[PDB]
Amino acid sequence: KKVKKIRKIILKEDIPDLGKKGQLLDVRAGFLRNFLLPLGKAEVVTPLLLKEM
Template sequence: MAKRVPVVLNESISKLGKNGDLVEVAPGFARNYLLPKGLANIATPGIIKQVEQRREKERLRKLAEKQEAEDRKTALKTIGRLVIRKQVGEANAIFGTVTAQEVADLIKEKAMLDVDKRGIDVPDISITGDYQVEVKLHPEVTATVDIEVAAL
């Protein structure tokens, strides 16, 4: 059987690897498909070193993103309770619902932080009272914000 050829991928290829991965493929696959289409390069020591440098930069960037999310979490803790005013009916039942957009707008107003509304998990709120809302700031960082739903 033929020897395998180590290549570094230039693009993500399903069932083979992601961009920058070092993989071993059959020589014919590399020679006839990956190399002519520019999807991979033969793994030389110089190219492997470049890939390692790129990975280190990416790791540092992700670490900085996580640290920024931790700082934002601390900022959200310091603002305290947020108050949302809603029109109420009998037995303190609110008309409508509290949306993630309303919470995001209130956070922006009070804490000067932009938060994506898709990362906000608002529980079902049907009456006035105190609630906790989870705000996902990063895949590994989640903050809890206390909100109070009050009458207009």
């Protein structure tokens, strides 16, 4: 019935799957929370950091 968020991110260290610290692949919500944010292996796309870095 329903799909869940597919949330943009930006990286902090190379991904063995999608990109080497540059790409913006909208990973998944069930993925940013554990591997990406626990392991500090990603940063969420804040509109604040974008236009200042």
